[PDB]
Write an enzyme that holds these catalytic residues in place. Sequence first.
Site, PDB file in Angstrom:
ATOM      1  N   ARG A   3       0.880  -1.169   0.000  1.00 37.68           N
ATOM      2  CA  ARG A   3       0.000   0.000   0.000  1.00 37.68           C
ATOM      3  C   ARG A   3       0.910   1.209   0.000  1.00 37.68           C
ATOM      4  NH1 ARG A   3      -4.174   2.768   3.342  1.00 37.68           N
ATOM      5  NH2 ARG A   3      -3.815   4.137   1.527  1.00 37.68           N
TER       6      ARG A   3
ATOM      7  N   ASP B 231      -1.591  -0.693   8.968  1.00 35.09           N
ATOM      8  CA  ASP B 231      -0.452  -0.001   8.336  1.00 35.09           C
ATOM      9  C   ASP B 231       0.858  -0.260   9.086  1.00 35.09           C
ATOM     10  OD1 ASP B 231      -1.156   1.241   5.869  1.00 35.09           O
ATOM     11  OD2 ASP B 231      -2.251   2.821   6.941  1.00 35.09           O
ATOM     12  N   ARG B 232       0.822  -0.125  10.423  1.00 38.26           N
ATOM     13  CA  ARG B 232       2.040  -0.316  11.225  1.00 38.26           C
ATOM     14  C   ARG B 232       2.192  -1.719  11.736  1.00 38.26           C
ATOM     15  NH1 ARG B 232       0.590   1.710  15.299  1.00 38.26           N
ATOM     16  NH2 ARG B 232      -1.409   2.701  14.763  1.00 38.26           N
TER      17      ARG B 232
ATOM     18  N   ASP C  44      -5.557  17.238   6.163  1.00 38.76           N
ATOM     19  CA  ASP C  44      -5.946  17.472   7.518  1.00 38.76           C
ATOM     20  C   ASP C  44      -6.948  16.392   7.822  1.00 38.76           C
ATOM     21  OD1 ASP C  44      -7.358  18.226   9.836  1.00 38.76           O
ATOM     22  OD2 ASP C  44      -6.840  20.303   9.559  1.00 38.76           O
TER      23      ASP C  44
ATOM     24  N   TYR D 175      -5.125   6.644  -2.316  1.00 33.72           N
ATOM     25  CA  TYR D 175      -4.137   7.718  -2.281  1.00 33.72           C
ATOM     26  C   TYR D 175      -3.769   8.150  -3.691  1.00 33.72           C
ATOM     27  CZ  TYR D 175      -3.089   7.309   2.812  1.00 33.72           C
ATOM     28  OH  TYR D 175      -3.131   7.292   4.187  1.00 33.72           O
TER      29      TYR D 175
HETATM   30 CA   LIG Z   1     -10.220  16.129   6.480  1.00 29.98          CA
HETATM   31  Y   LIG Z   2      -2.397   4.963   7.605  1.00 31.72           Y
END
Ligand SMILES: [Ca+2]
Ligand SMILES: [Y+3]
Lengths: 389, 389, 389, 389
Positions: free
Chosen positions: A39, A72-73, A216, A332
């Site tokens: 990803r 993700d981590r 944000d 993304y």
């Molecule tokens: Ca936002």
């Molecule tokens: Y993430």
Amino acid sequence: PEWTYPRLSCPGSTFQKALLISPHRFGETKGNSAPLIIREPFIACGPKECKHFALTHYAAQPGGYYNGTRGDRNKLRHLISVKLGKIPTVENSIFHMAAWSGSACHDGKEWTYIGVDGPENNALLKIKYGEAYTDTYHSYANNILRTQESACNCIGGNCYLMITDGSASGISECRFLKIREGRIIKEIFPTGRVKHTEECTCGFASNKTIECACRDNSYTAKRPFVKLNVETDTAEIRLMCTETYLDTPRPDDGSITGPCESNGDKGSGGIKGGFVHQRMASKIGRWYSRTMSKTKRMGMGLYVKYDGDPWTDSDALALSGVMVSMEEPGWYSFGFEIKDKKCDVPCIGIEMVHDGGKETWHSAATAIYCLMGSGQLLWDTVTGVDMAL
Amino acid sequence: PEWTYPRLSCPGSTFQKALLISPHRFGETKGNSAPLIIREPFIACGPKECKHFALTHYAAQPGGYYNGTRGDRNKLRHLISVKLGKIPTVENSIFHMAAWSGSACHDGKEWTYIGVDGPENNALLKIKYGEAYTDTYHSYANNILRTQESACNCIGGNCYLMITDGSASGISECRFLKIREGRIIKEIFPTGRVKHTEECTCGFASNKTIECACRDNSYTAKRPFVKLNVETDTAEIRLMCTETYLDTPRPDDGSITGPCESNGDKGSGGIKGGFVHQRMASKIGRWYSRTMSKTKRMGMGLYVKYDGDPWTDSDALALSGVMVSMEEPGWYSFGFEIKDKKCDVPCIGIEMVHDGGKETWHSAATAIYCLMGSGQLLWDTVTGVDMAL
Amino acid sequence: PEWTYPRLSCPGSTFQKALLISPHRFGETKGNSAPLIIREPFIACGPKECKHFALTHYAAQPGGYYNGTRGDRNKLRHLISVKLGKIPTVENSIFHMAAWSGSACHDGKEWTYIGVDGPENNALLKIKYGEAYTDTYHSYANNILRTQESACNCIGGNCYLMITDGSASGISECRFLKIREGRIIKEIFPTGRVKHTEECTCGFASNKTIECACRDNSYTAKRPFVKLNVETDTAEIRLMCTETYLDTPRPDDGSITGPCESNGDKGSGGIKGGFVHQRMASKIGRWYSRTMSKTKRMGMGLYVKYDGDPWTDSDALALSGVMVSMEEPGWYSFGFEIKDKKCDVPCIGIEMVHDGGKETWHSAATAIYCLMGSGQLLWDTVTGVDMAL
Amino acid sequence: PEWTYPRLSCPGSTFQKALLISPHRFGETKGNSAPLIIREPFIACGPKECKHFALTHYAAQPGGYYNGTRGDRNKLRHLISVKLGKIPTVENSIFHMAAWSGSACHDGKEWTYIGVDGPENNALLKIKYGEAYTDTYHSYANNILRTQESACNCIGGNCYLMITDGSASGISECRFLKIREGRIIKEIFPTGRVKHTEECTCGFASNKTIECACRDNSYTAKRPFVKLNVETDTAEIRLMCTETYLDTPRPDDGSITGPCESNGDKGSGGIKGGFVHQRMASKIGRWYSRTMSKTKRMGMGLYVKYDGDPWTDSDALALSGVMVSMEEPGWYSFGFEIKDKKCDVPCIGIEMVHDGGKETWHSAATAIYCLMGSGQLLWDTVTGVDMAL
Ligand SMILES: [Ca+2]
Ligand SMILES: [Y+3]
Ligand SMILES: *[C@@H]1O[C@H](CO)[C@@H](O)[C@H](O)[C@H]1NC(C)=O
Ligand SMILES: *[C@@H]1O[C@H](CO)[C@@H](O)[C@H](O)[C@H]1NC(C)=O
Ligand SMILES: *[C@@H]1O[C@H](CO)[C@@H](O)[C@H](O)[C@H]1NC(C)=O
Ligand SMILES: *[C@@H]1O[C@H](CO)[C@@H](O)[C@H](O)[C@H]1NC(C)=O
Ligand SMILES: [Ca+2]
Ligand SMILES: [Ca+2]
Ligand SMILES: [Ca+2]
Ligand SMILES: [Y+3]
Ligand SMILES: [Y+3]
Ligand SMILES: [Y+3]
Ligand SMILES: [Y+3]
């Protein structure tokens, strides 16, 4: 070889479908391939080659390690790359370093590789220059120290990189690292609207300024927009004023009342968003992308505005084309530039995640659109992947 | 490195079997390989390397994406390549760009890659120079803008490319693009018999002239024969006069009554056909291939004529040898030249498609015949592939 | 780069086990690899690289094309190579040309590739220089035109190659081709005992002389021994006089009565044998290999003699060591030299065939022994392959 | 290119997790990969590349050759390598030479490869320089002649290598070899405490001295510590005085009563341990690793002391961090240095063996930790491998 600098962009007035990297077209049980589960892909180019980067779960399809690939981590996550054009499989890929948040960029002479790993409360950014590990930077807000998920940017040997730290639902004041030959030589503390900034997609507006469209995740669907002067090493951040809000989720275009700096509604959550510059003699083009759905990570539209100030311009961004239909995943996106012989080619890459929940594997294709020729954007991109196979 | 130019061909008076690339010898269910599903292969060489190109369905054998591999156009189709000699598998291949019609050529300094994608009614030809997307060209007749399916041809930096657009069953007036360092610098409108020309196999007759043997899919089994003057940038098209009709389907040799320009029968349908030049001091040789079957895409025979004018010569082409027997598939064929130290080697490549209908996978091998030594052509080529495995 | 020449051999007085290439250690059904099915391997070195060559049946293990892999001649057979040290799989290998009999050699500037294919009664030798097919030679006895199955030998740019043609059970008068930059510039007709000579293993005795130990498949278990003077381009052949007959099958050592030139018994059949030179200042060493079994292709022993004349010396060759035990297959063997910075390393390679009959796959590993250090040959080589897996 | 020399180490006061190479993340039955079965991995770097070496059983996972992979010595065992970063699979790997004990190093111009094979009572060490087998050394105590299992060390063209020979339960007096361009030019007989030394992990303390932390498999849990003066070519060995005993098995820290030279208890058995130098202007850092368990090959801790004398210093080593937890396997560990543009990066590599006993496959992952930045070691390394799959 000498240090690289941003040049005038190559001629053109429209983006077109350039390349799809969809490694899971080969991950069928019935097949004989090993595409990596990845990803957060991005691309970075030097003077001869473009590298396709991603963060892998150190697992392949087909395979027995699907559990935990939606997260993700973890301690297995690594920054990988292939030459752009090669399918990122087990054998094709090269493993750069352990990372669950990455970046990379070429300075004209050598690759800089950026990789964050470590515990949530005390993560660590690591810098690799070619083959050598050269520097680190430490967590300063003790809540997931994080970086761009796209290419950093080098000029005259100095590579600028956004880092951030802080709550995903609260404050995350980003900072910029000035990196030379793998070593941090300046910390740049941005001023202005610094409440929450993460996953900046940055590029050169000129030889003087680096501009980023950021995420944000807490307060607004407007993208924080960074302007970093690379000569005085100063950074300033204000929200993009355009009614065409680029984040997902988001409310209706123009529905946020008040002056440029108003937040206001549907601000929690977010998405990294594509952004690239078209530099011309007496004109600047700013290209952006956002999901076709307001709420979901579905589809991707390309937008453009020429000149003006993104901080003060409330005018709508012109819709240029649909790069990914509403029926296809659009996660993304990121900007990068291909280096032609005498000029630079602006491009937008799209992560198109194969999402079937946590009970199956979780990975991504990469679609690439580039500025080429004139006219209008002509075709959308599909991954062609059936996740049942 | 400097620009390349056609040279005198290497000594030789006969073609011989050179190399087979049969990737599907390794696509058994019982095997552990991933040969790509492709079609429209072609080869292009530069001063040190030959790349084997094809258009892939982004699908491998064995695999679960066989449905739609008999079709030509889709959103997944891509221009791929390997170094000639290498098996075009998932990992060995490099993906250049989305394309369901392709071409490529080396100009002495860099690779130009050509790829057409987009919708039927507004397709787009895209040019890549090395790694950089550099130019586009738009649909002019709005009915499947298409290109050569074989190598373009570069001289002193200027690469000439045939493009066509229009009905498969009616009018398709081809044009030529002059491309320098990835950007189109001239459109060349051919004159003469321009009713229907597609899938031109082009090559240098000399430093002044480019000749192509093309496909009329509508009106004739005679091949349109292009003569492009590269100095004046002027092109002219007339049908080949020879009784030895090179298209498939076709009527019996010499059955078309009338003067050179007569169509007449069994003209609907067609096939891309191979064509290469043997350039000698005071003599030119033109080498051609056609299917051994008049109606079906079975077999491939190699033909030759020295000197004369293909527009006015009604004399039969000398049968040189049988490259692919009637029992083996003989689909598209194409011309290319290998660069020896001081001279050029003319070669004919043959697409040998594995066709078991739309209910299974649909791909091709590539057989290569080159000019070498004296005597007569000695051996035919078989794919060796069993499609049940 | 300049033309290469034989140099004085590197110091040493004993061969040792250097490297095993056993590709079918990975050909299990339970596995995920594609080692190629090959036979007649050989190795050839240039100034920077050694290439491991073989003739493939264009099939892998595991695979569905085992039927016909015990044959040698077919329309699918190709000459392949990998960098020595790499496993010859489908993806690692490069396919050079169609061939069921091969050779190759580096001249200091470029690779010459040699490949024979075509029908039994009119076979064809094909020459490739780098990427270009450059020349051919025709069958002159119309009965399986054939070549070395080992490296050819280049000096000052002139590469010498043994070719033969004729019955496997009667006359096969060999010839030598002088090849320069891919093209034949002389035919050398050997004199003497020319009755039957095939699969010559050739090497430089000096800058003046090439020597080969060859196979007589009809008349004798003595190896015909070629001496080719490369300055006058003259070649002579006489049987090796040594009581240590190197062919398989063979009678007992020294049992052939008569002077050097006597045939006499068990002469029908044969095997390619390894032969390499150890060149010293005032002394020459000749290293040979032969099967451990007298009648079967089992085992491989290394033997050596210093100085003398192989044509007149009846003295037994000194047994140096057992490279392959009686329990392991010992098929073809060959000589080659690795290029050290200032000197040459003589090496003997062994084809170790996995023979289960015609009802299963038929391929080979390669064992390499090289001159290195002092003392005695210490360890034997097993393939470690279980053919049932 | 010119000869390489040790330089001042790069800035840094702590090691961090750098890279995991876990090839068995891909060896599931449900998978399509072929990770090699290996042990004794180690890394060695030259000026542009790091190579990840290991000893393979010439077998992959999944595979049918698991029987015998728990052993070390056999006729199939080979020294292999990949570029560090690449997964060591059948196809990615290159096979250097037959070896069941290995080493390798770069001298600024070329790679020297070291590999021991042969019978127990008369093994042979083999030296390869680039592609050429150049020299050998013979068994001197006739009981498993053995080497480092880690990188040798080159200075000014001269590469120093530890070799040992003798009972694993008794006397093993090690020697050093001085190797130049692949040929042994000096034997160096160490003096002092020479009772038992094997598997030395060596590095440059300075341009004058090479220091090694070695294994005593018989008498002591203290590590024999070699100091080799490369200018005079003299070596000296004494036991490490530190109470922080580095071997496994071992008694409690500081429980060995007596002066520095005392053996005393739990000495039989052992493990190769990691050891690397941090060279600073007027200060030396010595970094070591030992298992987290005192008895078992579980976990791995990193330790450090600056300055002083390892022979006389009884002070505890500072615990720096936990690189591998007690729950994860911690087998062999090794030192190596990566070459940055102007300085050297010290690193510790850790073999993490997947051990399920002799009834299944037996192989290893490799964890890498390097000196980078300031602070403290932050994260541990897991293989993520489930051996049932
Ligand atoms: Ca936002
Ligand atoms: Y993430
Ligand atoms: C940026 O700076 C370099 C020299 O410092 C120059 O060659 C280049 O043209 C400049 N870029 C732009 C966009 O003007
Ligand atoms: C083509 O032109 C170049 C120089 O312009 C020349 O070197 C070459 O020999 C000419 N080609 C032929 C086929 O005469
Ligand atoms: C062979 O000839 C070349 C010069 O022609 C020379 O450099 C080389 O050392 C000679 N080889 C032998 C074996 O003497
Ligand atoms: C070691 O010696 C070389 C020159 O002999 C020098 O360049 C290098 O800096 C020295 N290394 C150290 C660690 O002082
Ligand atoms: Ca037609
Ligand atoms: Ca015989
Ligand atoms: Ca011990
Ligand atoms: Y079509
Ligand atoms: Y045969
Ligand atoms: Y051991
Ligand atoms: Y592979």
